[PDB]
């Protein structure tokens, strides 16, 4: 089977700049006629593969003309000569030579747009879930860069090291931004015997931590 | 454009046929490749079947040992993947890709197949709001979407939309212990489409379980 090797495996490139993506074949794609049987796709966030060169250089249906693929044989590069927030995704190279059509590991293309703070919002049990047995406190940040961000729940002031999960969404293809869903999930007799619930988040575009809180029935 | 459907929740060892169909031009004159995507992963190639000019000759992933069949219904426009003694392994967002015959290297919206043996399980949701002050002029609120099986396919909308308004969606994550997942959806809207004493509605459809309709007050 051909083997396709993408490199680098992740950028994070400035509006305006160029950005290249390079992709290296175990065998040579050169066909009789000329042209190379080596295709680029890319993969938005949310949505399914699309086409943006095929044949080594040729710029598929409304594709920008910032988008280039180069390369003969074993060595493609793809080229974005100044890259923008919607550029965001998974860029794939794919050989069509022989079955199996092979494709390479995937090289996630950030947009490094400038610090953005996050908006932090704290949301309590609602006694619907109290009901139940378990309650479950919803720390939400909203459309910040860079990713990096770190969330930490204290209990009456104490820190917690388990009992939390996250996700982060996808860099938003407009704003390029990120945003985070932090859910610390106790059980209803724990959720009682304390009194003060907060998430605490450190990133970059904030001062210092910033802390949402609240006193559980206080509301 | 092409629609795909077909898959779902399958216990190893299952069956499932899957469908792409063309809707608005015919698919007798192009190749159907099928590729699949497990979640947060690059892409594989299972198997393809050729036009009914090249007598419909299939061709499939070697590691797929003889389980797959790439078939095609020229008078219901449709090619199908069929999947016996379905794997765990097997769990991925399946695509049908388009060859040839235009619109040619075009890819589907992709069917979700989840091999497990663990039980579906419906999401506990609940209305979220804020202890604290409203943003000025905009309220937040939101709905946890608490212990649910399979992660996907699952969707949240709200009774509320328009200008000013913005749905926050999460990807699910796991949770500490089991096999269940959480996430949650939020909605800022302006305060004037949230008066106080009115109610919004979260609409969650999880997998084929019935959908479920949570009230959520205004500030």
């Known amino acids: 089977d051909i083997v396709m090797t993408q490199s680098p495996l992740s950028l994070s490139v400035t509006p305006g700049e160029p950005a290249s993506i390079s992709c290296r074949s175990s065998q040579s794609l050169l066909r009789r006629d000329g042209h190379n049987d080596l295709e680029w796709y890319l993969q938005k966030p949310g949505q399914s593969p699309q086409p943006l060169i095929y044949?080594?250089?040729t710029r598929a249906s409304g594709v920008p003309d910032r988008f280039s693929g180069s390369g003969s044989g074993t060595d493609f590069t793809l080229k974005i000569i100044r890259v923008e927030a919607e550029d965001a995704g998974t860029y794939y190279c794919?050989?069509?030579?022989?079955?199996?059509?092979?494709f390479g590991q995937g090289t996630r293309l950030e947009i490094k747009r400038t610090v953005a703070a996050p908006s932090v919002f704290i949301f309590p049990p609602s006694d619907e879930q109290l009901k139940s047995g378990t309650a479950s406190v919803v720390c939400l940040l909203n459309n910040f860069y860079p990713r990096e961000a770190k969330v930490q729940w204290k209990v009456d002031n104490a820190l917690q090291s388990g009992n939390s999960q996250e996700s982060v969404t996808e860099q938003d293809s407009k704003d390029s931004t990120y945003s985070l869903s932090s859910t610390l999930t106790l059980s209803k007799a724990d959720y009682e015997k304390h009194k003060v619930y907060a998430c605490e988040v450190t990133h970059q575009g904030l001062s210092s931590p910033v802390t949402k809180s609240f006193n559980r029935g206080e509301c | 454009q092409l629609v795909e459907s077909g898959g779902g929740l399958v216990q190893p060892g299952g069956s499932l046929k899957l469908s792409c169909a063309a809707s608005?031009?015919?698919?007798?004159?192009?190749?159907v490749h099928w590729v699949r995507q497990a979640s947060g992963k690059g892409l594989e190639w299972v198997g393809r079947?050729?036009?009914?000019?090249?007598?419909?000759?299939?061709a499939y992933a070697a590691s797929m040992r003889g389980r797959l069949t790439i078939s095609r219904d020229d008078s219901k426009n449709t090619a199908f993947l069929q999947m016996n003694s379905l794997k765990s392994d097997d769990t991925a967002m399946y695509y049908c890709?388009?060859?040839?015959?235009?619109?040619?290297?075009?890819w589907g919206q992709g069917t979700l197949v989840t091999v497990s043996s663990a039980s579906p399980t419906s999401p506990k949701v609940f209305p979220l709001s804020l202890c604290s002050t409203q943003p000025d002029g905009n309220v937040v609120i939101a709905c946890l979407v608490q212990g649910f099986f399979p992660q996907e396919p699952l969707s949240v909308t709200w009774s509320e939309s328009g200008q000013g308004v913005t749905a926050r969606n999460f990807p699910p994550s796991q949770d500490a212990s089991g096999d269940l997942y959480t996430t949650s959806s939020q909605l800022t809207l302006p305060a004037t489409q949230c008066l106080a004493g009115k109610s919004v509605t979260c609409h969650v459809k999880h997998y084929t379980n019935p959908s479920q309709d949570v009230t959520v007050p205004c500030p």
């Open positions: 794919m050989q069509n030579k022989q079955t199996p059509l092979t």
């Open positions: 044949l080594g250089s």
């Open positions: 079947i050729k036009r009914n000019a090249e007598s419909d000759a299939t």
């Open positions: 890709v388009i060859r040839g015959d235009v619109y040619n290297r075009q």
């Open positions: 608005g031009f015919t698919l007798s004159g192009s190749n």
